């Protein structure tokens, strides 16, 4: 009597929601047995100041769904720049998630993580049914705010204020190799056939994003948008400073190279260990995120 | 029980994008508001969330509307965000916009936009939770305007900074906040705290400088502004920063109220202070 048929492309919609940048939280609580349970959530909002109200959304598909909705108290841990691993641990299917964080129990028995950007001890007010998820509303009972910069998530992956500084230091040291994790759908652009390499060009001076956008657009014949810094490092083998950006390509077949889905990258040979590390990160940050 | 500033500042730790919720009132006139307390709720059915203060002027018009739209602003749309947070007579004069298939104001050059139908309005304290079912949407690859802690951040600035850094020496400045007070050096002619260097991590350098200067603990945040001083000729990298509690060794933390008839070191310094006081008179909650 209701219409069970796809209207929008789940990828297209998920990617559109991704345009709105968010920080990263880890929702924590204790199950019926008193065992700490948790999950990474970026679908969080500050609701009211008087009374102190907060919001977070949990998928009905969650393993912890029953334990969570049944819990009376929960805590929101707003992760800092250095807590990329916590976000991954608490989003990935791991045996003991709480073994990846230094944590303690709050005044109201909720797992509070250390070195976080901010944390909030809550009491559940209401659980609102909303599609494939539920809206959990909590009343802030206790909180703390360290000046600590928070871990961010925009579009594909994480961003941190840290990297801008790291990039500037590298840029002054000498020439930089400007690389990019250029995504089409969920497919990363890679140059070569037998030994795949990320698109890059080594320059000294100018706006790295402007330079890289021009290079990529020329290379692929596609329209490109350079986003947040992905990684800044010194190649241990090469010796060269490396500035890697997260980027997006318009639809179509590129002039040269190809866009590969994580499934195709499984048994692929890479230009360098660094290149492989970045691809490993891309495929892992592809196996995670809100919705399916 | 809780300090509204302390709590507001704690919520601010969680970065967001910047949306402009739009609709048409009973008279059919376009209405809108800047909102950052937005969340993607469900994929099947497509569900979305945005919070509106009960104190809002448009509160009655909004809750009474059946359809609305979400405008996920891009990096270049700081001033759109400002217009729609501030009380101006013609807000819609500040944006190139059109009406969507369901008669909602859709802005051009946005990072993404969502056309919705109201599903429910949930009462939640000094605000209401508006739930919308997506009827249409569009996503340009465009980077979004971001809001973390006291102000805006954009991916743009990282690149802008790197270009400047390679050109030569940079003046590293900071919008260093204590409570709602910005740190300023000098007595008659106030200047933002800064030091000119060539090489190293600008954030590391600035944290060291500020901590030494003030005798306070500092956290350097997102890039605030990158520009070339028109008078000086010097490249300027300005960071958003935070100071621990207490009186600084030198200089002083001034409230927007105290800055009103204050003389500044340069027009640029004044532009940044103007921006600080304006992005102080805006943000979620009153
Ligand atoms: C950045 C990011 C944001 C996420 N946001 C949410 C969210 O808001 N709600 C949700 O249910 N899952 C979210 N997830 C995925 C979950 O953490 C996780 O896979 C699962 O729902 C919790 O594990 P469980 O099934 O064992 O409870 C997110 C993952 C990432 C990386």
Report yes or no: A172 at the B interface, CB cutoff 8 Å. Answer: yes
- Asked whether residue A41 is marked as a ligand-binding residue, the answer is yes
Distance (Å, whole) CA A209 – CA B115: 31
Residues 99 through 128 of chain B touching chain A, CB cutoff 8 Å:
111-112, 114, 122, 124-127
Contact A164 B223 (CB under 8 A): yes
Report yes or no: A180 at the B interface, CB cutoff 8 Å. Answer: no
Contact A48 B201 (CB under 8 A): no
Closest partner residue to A47 (CB to CB) among B127, B148, B202 is B127
**CATH superfamily placement of domain A164-292:** Nucleoside Triphosphate Pyrophosphohydrolase (3.90.79.10)
Residue of chain A whose Cα is closest to the Cα of B5: A49
Report yes or no: B244 at the A interface, CB cutoff 8 Å. Answer: yes
Q: Computed from CA positions of residues B70, B93, B145, B3, in that sequence, does the dihedral angle turn out positive or negative?
A: negative
Asked, as a colleague might, if the bond just before B156 is cis with ω within 30 of 0, I would say no
- Pick among 3.90.1010.10, 3.10.129.10, 3.90.79.10, 2.102.10.10: CATH of B158-286: 3.90.79.10
Query: CATH 2.30.110.10 spans which residues of chain A?
Result: 1-163
Residue of chain B whose Cα is closest to the Cα of A207: B163
Contact B137 A208 (CB under 8 A): no
Method by which the model was determined: X-ray
Burial class (CB within 10 angstroms; exposed 0-12, middle 13-18, buried 19+) of B74: buried
**CATH architecture of residue range(s) B1-157:** Roll (2.30)
Q: Find the distance separating the first CA and the last CA of chain A, reported in whole Å.
A: 26
Query: B60: which 2 tokens?
Result: 């009655």
- Asked whether residue B156 is marked as a ligand-binding residue, the answer is no
* Cα B77–chain centre separation: 11
CB B121 within 8 Å of CB B131: yes
Residues 62 through 101 of chain B touching chain A, CB cutoff 8 Å:
72
Cβ neighbours of residue A104 under 8 Å, at least 6 residues apart?
A: A111, A112, A114
CB A36 within 8 Å of CB A28: yes
Report yes or no: B158 at the A interface, CB cutoff 8 Å. Answer: yes
Closest alpha carbon to B36 in B5, B82, B1: B82
Report yes or no: A175 at the B interface, CB cutoff 8 Å. Answer: no
CB B21 within 8 Å of CB B48: no
- Asked whether residue B35 is marked as a ligand-binding residue, the answer is yes
Question: Within 10 A of A218 (CB to CB), how many other CB atoms are there?
Answer: 12
DSSP letter, residue A98: G
Closest alpha carbon to B128 in A128, A23, A58: A128
CB A56 within 8 Å of CB A43: yes
Query: What is the third-level CATH fold of A1-163?
Result: Pnp Oxidase; Chain A (2.30.110)
Contact A164 B158 (CB under 8 A): yes
Phi-psi region of A263 (alpha: psi -120 to 50; beta: other; left: phi over 0): alpha
Query: CATH 3.90.79.10 spans which residues of chain A?
Result: 164-292
Query: A45: which 2 tokens?
Result: 């909002």
Which three-class secondary structure state does DSSP give residue B129? strand
Distance (Å, whole) CA B130 – CA A132: 17
Per DSSP (E only), the strands in B54-206 are: 67-72, 97-99, 105-107, 112-124, 127-138, 146-148, 151-153, 170-177, 182-184, 189-190, 194-197
CB A56 within 8 Å of CB A25: yes
Distance (Å, whole) CA B67 – CA B10: 32
Query: CATH 2.30.110.10 spans which residues of chain B?
Result: 1-157
CB A200 within 8 Å of CB A180: yes
CA B270 vs CA A44, B181, B259, B261, B280: distances in Å: 35, 15, 10, 11, 15
Closest alpha carbon to B174 in A161, A279, A182, A284: A161
Query: CATH 3.90.79.10 spans which residues of chain B?
Result: 158-286
CB B139 within 8 Å of CB A154: no
Contact B155 A228 (CB under 8 A): yes
Question: Within 10 A of A96 (CB to CB), how many other CB atoms are there?
Answer: 8
Question: Within 10 A of A271 (CB to CB), how many other CB atoms are there?
Answer: 15
CB A24 within 8 Å of CB A42: yes
How many Å is the Cα radius of gyration of chain A? 21
- Test mutation, B15, B81, B131, chain A, max A CBs within 10 A: B15
- Asked whether residue A67 is marked as a ligand-binding residue, the answer is no
Distance (Å, whole) CA B285 – CA B7: 10
Q: Checking DSSP bridges between strand B67-72 and strand A152-154, what pairing results, if any?
A: unpaired
Q: How many Cα atoms are found within 13 Å in the side-chain-facing hemisphere of B220?
A: 26
Closest ligand 1 atom to the C-alpha of A62?
25
């Amino acid at each position: 009597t209701e219409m069970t048929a796809e209207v929008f492309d789940p990828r297209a919609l998920r990617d559109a929601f991704g345009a709105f940048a968010t920080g990263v939280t880890v929702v924590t609580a204790s199950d019926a047995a008193g065992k700490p349970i948790g999950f990474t959530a970026n679908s969080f909002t500050s609701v009211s100041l008087d009374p102190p109200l907060l919001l977070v959304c949990l998928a009905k598909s969650s393993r912890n769904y029953e334990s969570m909705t049944s819990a009376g108290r929960f805590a929101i841990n707003v992760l800092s720049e250095t807590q990329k691993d916590v976000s991954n641990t608490f989003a990935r299917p791991v045996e003991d998630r709480f073994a990846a964080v230094d944590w303690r129990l709050g005044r109201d028995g909720c797992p509070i993580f250390s070195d976080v950007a901010a944390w909030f001890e809550c009491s559940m007010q209401d659980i609102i049914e909303a599609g494939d998820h539920v809206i959990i509303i909590g009343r802030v009972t206790a909180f703390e705010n360290s000046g600590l910069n928070g871990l961010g998530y925009a579009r594909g992956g994480y961003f941190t204020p840290r990297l801008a500084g790291k990039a500037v230091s590298a840029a002054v040291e000498g020439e930089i190799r400007l690389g990019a994790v250029l995504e089409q759908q969920g497919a990363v652009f890679l140059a070569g056939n037998e030994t795949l390499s990320l698109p890059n060009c080594t320059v000294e001076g100018g706006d790295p994003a402007r330079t890289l956008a021009a290079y990529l657009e020329q290379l692929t014949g596609l329209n490109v948008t350079i986003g947040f810094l992905y990684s800044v490092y010194e190649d241990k083998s090469d010796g060269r400073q490396n500035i890697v950006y997260h980027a997006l390509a318009s639809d179509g077949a590129p002039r040269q190279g190809r866009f590969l889905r994580p499934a195709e990258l499984a048994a692929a040979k890479f230009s360098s260990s660094a290149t492989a590390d970045i691809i490993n990160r891309f495929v892992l940050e592809s196996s995670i995120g809100n919705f399916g």
